[PDB]
């Protein structure tokens, strides 16, 4: 190693020390050439590596979203995914990934519920631990986020999560505990919200008492972006580095003046934070030979290979959960006469919105995956629209027809169209132009002239669209058609083949920024539903693709309800009536109500599948991948059944975690409230059976062997063995049972394997004793329940525990 | 009067001042003779006046329990009830009543749920305010309790209620704000529990910041009994007086040492507490010529009159809620051939358990009520037993079996000794001798010059003769707090001395029940003897009260046979009247119910009776909801609560239509325990209870979730039918005047209807309940008759929510809906209106 | 030793445990007959042993006052003084002596200035240490008093000594530190006053953070007489035993009502205090052979010998300070008129 933390700490002067406590820009820590300390690049996010730009982003591999990844219940595969994320990161020259995410879906409506793993803390913690192992094994630093209780988006910079120490310990801190214990993440990012009255990013209890004194974790803490709220407290209380730069709270003047005036912090506080930042740079520098990361290096698409594609396709396929399949409707045969219908059928809903999304090398739509599978054109009808806003203009705009004449051209200007006599130019491929992290020499106010030609493909009405932050004007054929803002629309009649001129005059956010101009073919909503029904009736099978998208589920706001959008439900009822052998494929990051569920004979949950989403869906539907995912989340019938129904809004600045330890399936089992599909549920195209085949308990370990067998005679497949524990005679209220182990096993038809699950008792059966402030292994009788979902328990074993244990730590 | 608070304060020396900050005994303040300050007597409770003792207490008039009272939805009648309670108190020479109780049933399982009024803070506040007005108009001081958030009994002395300021303000504090605003009670009693980490009885926020600085209330705070936990902080933080005496926390030595050492308190804090005690005593003395109270006076039954019986009978009949009545089962008529069946039919379940209970003049069982109504004997069978423990020994024994079952000869003899029977000279005389009528010997407040209040150490020998009325097996039982041995014919049958196990007895602090079944012979005379030592006698480690004991006997039965029998007899009658429910041992101060179930074989009995005969009326006695699993097959259902002395006549009045059922449920009645908002957080765990449902309590929760319940808040049927509409409506910028016309559309029965007025905010950005009760009126109507009732109130009263972030109540500009109906689920007439003048306020 | 602290702690019930946390009368702790725990007799003071009474008290040997003692600047003689104090205590059948006293004469007018050793912390601490060594070598428990900053008498039960941490540490704590380090006294008595707003007898900073966590001293803290001011805070914050009896602040009802109401203290706090009282008693009991102390025994003038006589005369002669002697006035001649 050429990197010595303590030596450096002893050589840095005070100004240099202060300069290490904030990032330079959105993505980079501070270079100190004098001492051989490089700038380190970080990059979002948990489902693929975006790089240093949103607008004009270098393309990258988008992975399935977190709740889909967790539904694999496959540690090895999750490790493989983190290794591939590392390779994706190296290709962007980012030494640290801002992921994975592991907040908790205590209710279903969280705007970032798609982005984390699981309502279960053991599944969330092992998924986290597995991704981090895979990232860090390649020499790339993980950042587990957001610590802690950032479990909804509403007013997140100020929201006070008010939560008991028992629920804080057992549910919210637990996946971080597990990640730390098993994977040692190099970084953790603090949340935006408060916990019990105190912003996480200056909470000594969280940042120091727990992470440092109790858990002995020696990583680096960074703020979420702008999630610092004081100068001195955050430094005293354990926040190692403020992002993004340029610093707001930690200028040289603010910090040294606090030091020199004996206001709250000491030079020792500052050194403690600089020391953690140096340990993080030490990991990066020690790994440079292995990763090849170039300081301030170029960003490329070099990881866009067949190997990456096939692995993304596998990870997406195994994420998929088969929820219903009556009458052997699935698998489809390639000779089936089918029509594909639905608002998501030709959509590319690769991810949810915001920080975790990106510019992909490509996304295969579900329709394209089915055309690719069948090797021919497939009958289609859209059925219904379900977009939140109109986009699609850049994606369908331009003589030549080239894939390089494709889109719009953006020409940036110093002054307005209203006053220019007669600096940056960019080929725009997506209608949502997101200028937040945009930078140029001639900018801090700037203006944009967005141009191209649009050619309608059908005769009739088209609805043109524009949204801005916060100035623009939309021109078609040099006539003004449309004057953060609401969506404003103009409907106009056009003609197939005819070329129109699109011109958007935009002014920057002070007039950061952003805008979207879109267009869509208008339809008759009633007629298109009748048409899909009529068509579905005339085919053997229909495949109906529905769901939400990255505008309904997005960082920045929570969902208002659990409904499917617009006329989706009406569409589905009409199609099911016209053809009962319709398979429904749903894309969403979190649950949606299916009111017609009783009539749906085949139903597949695909999540948001990333670049290969549509091929993975085709793989499952045709049986080339046998469905093998299980729900990482409870799927209640109705929003009102959920434990957080009444407290999932920031009100008077707070959110009371009223259900306490009873989150997700812990709530439903305790109430005996029936759900549409429970935690851990998923079907296959084959049948399995299992039995505990050996069992052994000591004073400190539990060892379980489980034989699993594929009893079908046609498909090979994987089953997920899930191991739950129950206290049968505790003095303390607990959930009916708790997931503490799982193993995934692949089995040829007729094949049998034995899997082994070994755990310390303290891992299996502790609850957090709030009054004593300690975890407790309580003497008494316990049950281990082994099954293939939280309900489908197939084999059980009773055992006694005589030796008590109180513990803290890992 | 000439009782002058400031002059007396200036004349008291520091020792007399300290001696005013604590009660002398269980029930009396400190007399200061040289200054003419009398000792003041206070008495439990919120549904009638027990007086100065539990054991051998003077009979009294027991009213219906609080959730029954509130179900009348009748302020005038509740105020009339408070006057009668004042007259009852004057007869016991008690100048201060310890009630009403208005904690909140945030879940249904609370042991004191029966005792308070309602899950709705407006109904609870207006009932409390009407009771207080009634007491205080007669010159008798009320004590609204328990302030605040004593909403379950589990570990109540240490239980930390963790509750947001919004819910604290809208639900829990609100019935006390209303009482203070409208009735100005003389006293308030603090709760045993903590709120957000601090014991109420020393919480500056509760006792001073809210009560004094915000609300300007000027009455006196007393602790709950033993409900004081420090010397100086309770005195600094606003607790005026500690009960009972002799003081633990406020001896002259403790308080003057604190003062002299500058530990926490100043003489000014002491003077501020003393001044509030003096103001209470001034109320009492100002009212002496009006009340006729005699200092340390005697206790009488002088109020046991026809006027009191009539009034108790009316109040109980009007508490009754009719829940179902199909196929004209009801009203019953003289011609119906009826059998009366069930564990509560001959029971006397007058009240819940604990400090609210009392020795009654008499109690009319529901069986007796029906017999009284028909003028003859009525067929009966027990059907099933539902007792929690075995009593009935004193109630069916004689001192001397060879003498007639006289008044003087019925019961047992209690003889009290300073020394146990194993030790005393045979010439040691008892220091006290008492005839015992009730088997539960409850010695909490027993007082005698031979019994040291700081260590109430004594023995009781209990004796008589038991003569069985049937050959067969009898189960005898003994429960104790202290120590006991039950002898039959001088043979030890039950040992509650050795290896005691903790159970339910005595507010959950005594032993489990031990029993002995013996084969007994009819008419044969058996000598029953109990030897008992009080709490401190028994060598069980810790600080003990005097305690109590219960010796019991019951005739064993063939339980299966009795259910078959019940069903066979029910088929042979035109109608069966099935009388079921809980009692004051299932629902009592001290512990909470474990579940919502009817006890033992009750449900099996009801299912058997409903099968044998579908023309069965079920009458349920409980203070809080029970699950009725067989509900769909029950065609006639009446909720009678615990109707006090006249309970049985009040039930017969309603069953036969002499009073036309007019009560409405003061509580939501969910189908299943798991449906309730507090299902997961109704237990003290790691010393705390988190009010996770926040403002969504009772119907506020169910409506918000759209969860169907068996019966909703405000629901109750009649023998007649009614209809209503809003006949006038006017909104100023500050007021709502609403007129409602109500008509009895039936042509046979007169009856009363309850108009309920709810409000809803239509487009706020703040989350609220769907709608909230803010007014009600009860109206009596002849068949065909129509009346207008008017409901005027301030907007601030009608549509404010507590803005927790600002620390203030807020009337938000916007659209509102007034909804008027005859239950929370039976809205008949609505009106939208707009508010544009917003308002922020604190206080009253 | 036949006296084991942990065994006995595991055998005491809650009422017995609470009864050990206060003295029974002015001078004795709580006998627990059923477990073989004797009552321990304590006696004043720093300059000789008074025994159980002021009025009608048994005659005893009075030593020179503390400021004279320290003026010897003689550690060996102060240890000798200590041993003779122990012999004096044995004759009174007191197992624990309430001394020595080492508050500090920051000004000269202190009511008890005569009783402590010196304005200098090093001399005060070596004097304390040597006195304690002599007392404890004979099997007799010392009580260094009063901890801390009881440096005047005026309104002492409430006086708040407001003192910077530097002065607290260099001047007032220092002789206690030196005593703990060199002599390990069996007991320390808390002062009546406050330090920086908190009564010393309930100051967690003093009685726990400094005495226990920092210095690792493992002796018993007793209050000065009636110098206890709360039930629960004093128990939580480290005051092992309240004197005298009968208890004001620690009746069974007060402590056990606090425990069962989750007001401030836990049964662990109560155990922590009992544990320290049992260690003191262990010290007395393990030394019963050496001292021959009789539980509740008589009080005698039995150490009234020529040998005790000669030693008190020596100690006194060596305390005397000659301040001036011009023109050989002294020494006097026997035939000088």
Residue A403 in tokens? 């894939």
Residue A452 in tokens? 């191209």
Check CB contact of B539 with chain C, cutoff 8 Å: no
Residues in a beta bridge with A161: A195, A655
CB B438: neighbour CB atoms within 10 A?
19
Contact between B317 and B74 (Cβ < 8 Å): no
**Residues of chain B with C-beta less than 8 angstroms from the C-beta of A164:** 162, 688, 690
Q: How far is CA B298 from the centre of its chain?
A: 26
**For chain C, which chains pass the contact test of at least 3 CB pairs under 8 Å?**
B
Check CB contact of B685 with chain C, cutoff 8 Å: no
Q: Which residues of C84-122 are buried (b: 16+ CB within 10 A; e: fewer)?
A: bbbbbbbbbbbbbbbbbbbbbbbeeebebbebbbbbbbe
Q: Are β-strands A408-413 and B143-147 bridged in parallel, bridged antiparallel, or unpaired?
A: unpaired
B480 Cα to chain C: minimum distance (Å): 21
d(CA A190, CA A200): 6
Residue A265 in tokens? 């912090």
d(CA A242, CA A24): 10
User: Which DSSP letter does residue B666 get?
Assistant: S
User: Which DSSP letter does residue B770 get?
Assistant: S
Q: Tell which residue, A614, A547, A616, A619, has the closest CA to residue A587.
A: A547
Phi, psi for C117 (deg, rounded to 5): -90, -60
| B683 → closest Cβ in A670, A673, A733 | A733
Q: Tell which residue, B618, B604, B622, B600, has the closest CA to residue B566.
A: B604
Residue B26 in tokens? 């269980």
Q: How far apart are the first and last CA of chain C?
A: 63
The overall longest dimension of chain B from CA atoms, in Å, is 86
| Residue C219: C-alpha distances to residues B69, C145, C207, C276 (Å) | 63, 13, 11, 7
From the number of C-beta atoms within 10 Å of its C-beta (0-12, 13-18, 19+), residue B800 rates as buried
The overall longest dimension of chain A from CA atoms, in Å, is 88
**Residues of chain A with C-beta less than 8 angstroms from the C-beta of B674:** 671-673
d(CA A446, CA A443): 7
For chain A, which domains are there?
1-292+633-678 (3.20.20.300), 306-382+524-623 (3.40.50.1700), 391-521 (2.60.120.260), 687-810 (2.60.40.10)
Contact between B64 and B315 (Cβ < 8 Å): yes
Q: Tell which residue, B746, B834, B766, has the closest CA to residue B795.
A: B834
Residues in chain A followed by a break, C to N above 2.5 angstroms: 398, 422, 444, 483, 511
| B263 → closest Cβ in C230, C248, C253 | C230
Taking CB atoms and an 8 Å limit, are B157 and C252 in contact across chains? no
d(CA B695, CA B692): 9
Taking CB atoms and an 8 Å limit, are B706 and A651 in contact across chains? no
From the number of C-beta atoms within 10 Å of its C-beta (0-12, 13-18, 19+), residue A295 rates as middle
Contact between A50 and A91 (Cβ < 8 Å): no
d(CA B395, CA B115): 26
Sheet holding A752-760, edge to edge: A688-697, A701-710, A752-760
Q: Tell which residue, C225, C271, C269, C279, has the closest CA to residue C249.
A: C225
With CA atoms as reference, the chain B residue closest to A673 would be B674
C-alpha count within 13 angstroms, C-beta hemisphere, residue B269: 21
C224 is catalytic: yes
Contact between A142 and A637 (Cβ < 8 Å): no
Which are the contacts of A624, defined by CB distance < 8 A and separation ≥ 6? Answer: A373, A618
Contact between A168 and A195 (Cβ < 8 Å): yes
**Residues of chain B with C-beta less than 8 angstroms from the C-beta of A659:** 680, 692
Contact between B650 and B661 (Cβ < 8 Å): no
| Residue B585: C-alpha distances to residues B354, B386, B391, B640, B643 (Å) | 9, 11, 11, 17, 16
Which are the contacts of B539, defined by CB distance < 8 A and separation ≥ 6? Answer: none
Resolution at which this structure was determined, Å: 2.2
Packing angle between helix A174-183 and helix A121-137, nearest 10 degrees? 30
DSSP string of B345-413, one letter each residue: TS----S-BSTT---BS----HHHHHHHHHTS--EEE------SS--BSGGGEESSTTS-S-TTTBSEE
Contact between B242 and B22 (Cβ < 8 Å): yes
Residue whose tokens read 């605003």 = B181
Residue A735 in tokens? 């959930």
Phi, psi for B323 (deg, rounded to 5): -100, -35
Contact between C198 and C161 (Cβ < 8 Å): no
Packing angle between helix A306-319 and helix A75-90, nearest 10 degrees? 140
Task: Identify whether B331 is preceded by a cis peptide bond (ω within 30 of 0).
Answer: yes
Residues in a beta bridge with B237: none
Q: Tell which residue, B135, B160, B152, has the closest CA to residue B42.
A: B135
Which are the contacts of A584, defined by CB distance < 8 A and separation ≥ 6? Answer: A544, A545, A546, A572, A600, A602, A603, A604
From the number of C-beta atoms within 10 Å of its C-beta (0-12, 13-18, 19+), residue B565 rates as middle
From the number of C-beta atoms within 10 Å of its C-beta (0-12, 13-18, 19+), residue A52 rates as buried
Check CB contact of C232 with chain B, cutoff 8 Å: yes
Residue ranges with strand state E in chain C: 42-43, 96-97, 141-147, 160-161, 187-190, 194-195, 198-199, 220-222
| Residue in B151, B224, B240, B318 annotated catalytic | B224
Packing angle between helix B75-91 and helix B306-319, nearest 10 degrees? 140
CB A624: neighbour CB atoms within 10 A?
13
User: Which DSSP letter does residue B672 get?
Assistant: S
Phi, psi for B38 (deg, rounded to 5): -80, 160
DSSP string of A695-764, one letter each residue: EEE-SSEEEEEEEEEE--SS--EEEEEEEEEEESS-SS---S-EEEEEEEEEE-TT-EEEEEEEEEHHHH
Contacts 24+ apart (CB under 8 A), B451-458: B451/B534, B451/B546, B453/B25, B453/B245, B453/B246, B454/B246, B455/B536, B456/B534, B456/B535, B456/B536, B456/B545, B456/B546, B457/B534, B457/B536, B457/B537, B458/B416, B458/B417, B458/B418, B458/B431, B458/B533, B458/B534, B458/B537, B458/B546
Query: Dihedral through CA A103, CA A790, CA A166, CA A225, nearest 10?
Result: 0
Residues in a beta bridge with A805: A777
Q: How far apart are the first and last CA of chain B?
A: 29
Query: Dihedral through CA B630, CA B636, CA B641, CA B644, nearest 10?
Result: -140
Instruction: State whether residue B572 is helix, strand or coil.
Output: coil
Task: Identify whether A45 is preceded by a cis peptide bond (ω within 30 of 0).
Answer: yes
Residue A746 in tokens? 């692949």
Residue A724 in tokens? 């739950």
SS (HEC) of A623-641:
CCCCCCCCCCCCECCCHHH
Instruction: State whether residue A799 is helix, strand or coil.
Output: strand
Taking CB atoms and an 8 Å limit, are B226 and C160 in contact across chains? no
d(CA A154, CA B256): 55
Residue whose tokens read 């995934």 = A744
Q: Tell which residue, A759, A743, A758, A737, has the closest CA to residue A708.
A: A743
d(CA C18, CA C245): 13
| Residue in C44, C151, C224, C269 annotated catalytic | C224
d(CA A743, CA A755): 7
Contact between B208 and B200 (Cβ < 8 Å): no
Q: How was this structure determined?
A: X-ray
d(CA B581, CA B509): 25
Which are the contacts of A292, defined by CB distance < 8 A and separation ≥ 6? Answer: A90
CB B415: neighbour CB atoms within 10 A?
16
Q: Which residues of B640-667 are buried (b: 16+ CB within 10 A; e: fewer)?
A: bbbbbbbbbbbbbbbbbbebbbbbbbbb
Residue whose tokens read 């006698």 = B537
d(CA B39, CA B27): 10
Taking CB atoms and an 8 Å limit, are A660 and B683 in contact across chains? no
User: Which DSSP letter does residue A215 get?
Assistant: T
d(CA B23, CA A433): 77
Q: Tell which residue, B218, B318, B232, B202, has the closest CA to residue B277.
A: B218
Q: How far apart are the first and last CA of chain A?
A: 29
d(CA A381, CA A392): 18
Which are the contacts of A272, defined by CB distance < 8 A and separation ≥ 6? Answer: none
| Residue B308: C-alpha distances to residues B80, B136, B201, B315 (Å) | 11, 18, 36, 11
Residue ranges with strand state E in A470-598: 471-476, 479-482, 488-494, 500-507, 514-521, 541-547, 582-587
CB A547: neighbour CB atoms within 10 A?
27
Taking CB atoms and an 8 Å limit, are B705 and A654 in contact across chains? no
Contact between A182 and A217 (Cβ < 8 Å): no
Contact between A777 and A762 (Cβ < 8 Å): yes
Sign of CA dihedral A3, A5, A11, A12: positive
SS (HEC) of A435-452:
CCCCCCCCCCCCEEEEEE
Contact between A27 and A43 (Cβ < 8 Å): yes
d(CA B272, CA B221): 12
Taking CB atoms and an 8 Å limit, are B542 and C14 in contact across chains? yes
Helix or strand (DSSP H, E) at A611: none
Q: Tell which residue, B478, B487, B488, has the closest CA to residue B510.
A: B478
Q: Are β-strands A220-222 and A500-507 bridged in parallel, bridged antiparallel, or unpaired?
A: unpaired
| Residue B724: C-alpha distances to residues A435, B161, B663, B788, C176 (Å) | 62, 42, 18, 9, 86
d(CA A724, CA B276): 60
Which are the contacts of B619, defined by CB distance < 8 A and separation ≥ 6? Answer: B344, B366, B577, B578, B579, B580, B581, B638, B640, B651, B655
**Residues of chain A with C-beta less than 8 angstroms from the C-beta of B692:** 647, 656-660
SS (HEC) of A363-428:
CCCHHHHHHHHHCCCCEEECCCCCCCCCCCCHHHCCCCCCCCCCCEEEEEECCCHHHCCCCCEEEE
d(CA B360, CA B62): 6
Which are the contacts of B45, defined by CB distance < 8 A and separation ≥ 6? Answer: B97, B98, B99, B101, B355, B356, B357, B358
Contact between A307 and A246 (Cβ < 8 Å): no
Task: Identify whether B148 is preceded by a cis peptide bond (ω within 30 of 0).
Answer: yes
Residues in a beta bridge with B581: B621
SS (HEC) of B461-497:
EEEEEECCCCCEEEEEEEEEECEEEEEECCEEEEEEC
From the number of C-beta atoms within 10 Å of its C-beta (0-12, 13-18, 19+), residue B290 rates as exposed
Q: How far is CA B457 from the centre of its chain?
A: 30
Instruction: State whether residue A38 is helix, strand or coil.
Output: coil
**For chain B, which chains pass the contact test of at least 3 CB pairs under 8 Å?**
A, C
Check CB contact of B595 with chain A, cutoff 8 Å: no
| B229 → closest Cβ in C157, C194, C257 | C257
C-alpha count within 13 angstroms, C-beta hemisphere, residue A547: 31
Sign of CA dihedral C4, C6, C7, C13: positive
d(CA B756, CA B456): 52
Residue A285 in tokens? 């520098």
């Amino acid at each position: 190693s050429k990197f010595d933390v303590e030596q450096l700490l002893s050589e840095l002067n005070q100004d240099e020390k202060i300069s290490l406590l904030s990032a330079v820009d959105f993505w980079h820590t501070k270079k100190i050439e004098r001492l051989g300390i490089p700038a380190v690049r970080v990059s979002d996010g948990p489902n693929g590596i975006r790089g240093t730009k949103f607008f004009d982003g270098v393309p990258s591999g988008c992975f399935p979203n977190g709740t889909g990844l967790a539904s694999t219940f496959d540690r090895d595969l999750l490790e493989t995914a983190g290794k591939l994320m590392a390779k994706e990161s190296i290709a962007k020259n980012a030494a640290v990934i801002l992921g994975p995410t592991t907040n908790m879906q205590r209710g279903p409506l969280g705007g970032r519920g798609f982005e984390s793993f699981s309502e279960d803390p053991y599944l969330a913690g092992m998924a986290t631990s597995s991704v981090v192992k895979g990232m860090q094994g390649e020499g790339i630093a993980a950042t587990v986020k957001h610590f802690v209780c950032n479990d909804l988006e509403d007013q997140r910079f100020s929201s006070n999560s008010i939560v008991s120490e028992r629920a804080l310990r057992e549910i919210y801190l637990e996946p971080f505990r597990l990640a730390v214990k098993h994977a040692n993440p190099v970084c953790i990012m603090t949340a935006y919200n408060k916990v019990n009255g105190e912003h996480c990013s200056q909470s000594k209890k969280l940042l120091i008492d727990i992470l440092r004194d109790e858990w002995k974790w020696d990583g680096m803490l960074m703020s979420d972006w702008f999630g610092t709220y004081t100068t001195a407290a955050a430094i005293k209380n354990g926040l190692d580095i403020e992002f993004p730069g340029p610093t707001r709270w930690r200028t040289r003047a603010l910090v040294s003046h606090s030091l020199n005036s004996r206001e709250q912090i000491t030079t020792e506080d500052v050194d403690d934070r600089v020391r953690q930042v140096l340990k993080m740079i030490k990991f990066v520098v020690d790994n440079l030979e292995k990763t090849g990361i170039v300081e301030n290096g170029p960003e490329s698409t070099s990881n866009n290979t067949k190997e990456t594609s096939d692995l993304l396709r596998k990870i997406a396929a195994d994420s998929i959960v088969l929820l219903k399949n009556k009458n052997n409707i699935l698998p489809l045969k390639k000779e089936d006469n089918i029509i594909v219908i639905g608002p998501n059928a030709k959509a590319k809903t690769s991810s949810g919105g915001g920080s975790a999304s990106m510019n992909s090398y490509y996304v295969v739509s579900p329709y394209e995956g089915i055309v690719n599978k069948l090797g021919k054109e497939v009958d289609y009808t859209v059925g219904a629209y379900s977009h939140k806003s109109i986009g699609g203009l850049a994606e369908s705009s331009l003589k030549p027809a080239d894939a390089e004449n494709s889109g719009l051209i953006a020409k940036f200007y110093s002054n307005p169209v209203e006053e220019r006599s007669d600096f940056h130019v960019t080929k725009v491929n997506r209608s949502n132009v997101h200028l937040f992290d945009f930078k140029h020499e001639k900018v801090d106010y700037f203006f944009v002239t967005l141009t191209g030609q649009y050619v309608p493909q059908e005769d009739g009405d088209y609805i043109f669209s524009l949204q801005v932050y916060g100035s623009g004007l939309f021109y078609l054929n040099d006539e003004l058609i449309i004057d953060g803002t609401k969506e404003r629309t103009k409907k106009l009649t056009l003609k197939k083949g005819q070329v129109y001129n699109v011109r958007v005059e935009y002014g920057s956010g002070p007039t950061a920024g952003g805008f979207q101009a879109g267009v869509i073919k208008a339809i008759d909503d009633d007629e298109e539903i009748r048409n899909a029904a009529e068509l579905a009736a005339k085919h053997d099978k229909a495949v109906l693709i529905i769901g939400l998208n990255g505008e309904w589920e997005t960082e920045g706001y929570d969902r208002e309800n659990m409904d499917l959008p617009k006329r989706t439900n009406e569409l589905v009822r009409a199609v099911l009536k016209a053809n009962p052998n319709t398979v429904i494929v749903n894309q969403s990051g979190t649950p949606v109500e299916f009111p017609w569920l009783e009539d749906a004979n085949a139903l597949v949950q695909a999540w948001y599948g990333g670049n290969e989403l549509g091929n993975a869906i085709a793989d499952v539907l045709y049986g080339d991948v046998v469905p093998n995912g299980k729900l990482s989340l409870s799927w209640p019938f109705k929003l009102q059944d959920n434990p957080a129904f009444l407290n999932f809004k920031t009100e008077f600045g707070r959110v009371i975690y009223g259900e306490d330890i009873f989150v997700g399936y812990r709530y439903y089992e305790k109430l005996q409230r029936k759900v549409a599909f429970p935690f851990g549920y998923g079907l296959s195209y084959t049948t399995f059976e299992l039995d505990i085949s050996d069992f052994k308990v000591t004073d400190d370990k539990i060892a379980i062997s489980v034989d699993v067998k594929n009893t079908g005679d046609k498909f090979a497949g994987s089953e997920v063995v899930q191991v739950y524990f129950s206290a049968l005679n505790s003095k303390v209220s607990r959930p009916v049972k708790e997931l503490k182990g799982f193993e995934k096993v692949h089995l040829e038809p007729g094949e049998k394997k034995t899997v082994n699950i070994d755990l310390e008792l303290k891992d299996a059966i502790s609850y957090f004793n709030e009054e004593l402030g300690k975890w407790h292994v309580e003497a008494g009788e316990y049950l281990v329940s082994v099954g293939t979902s939280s309900d489908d328990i197939l084999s059980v074993k009773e055992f006694k525990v005589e030796k008590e244990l109180y513990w803290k730590g890992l």
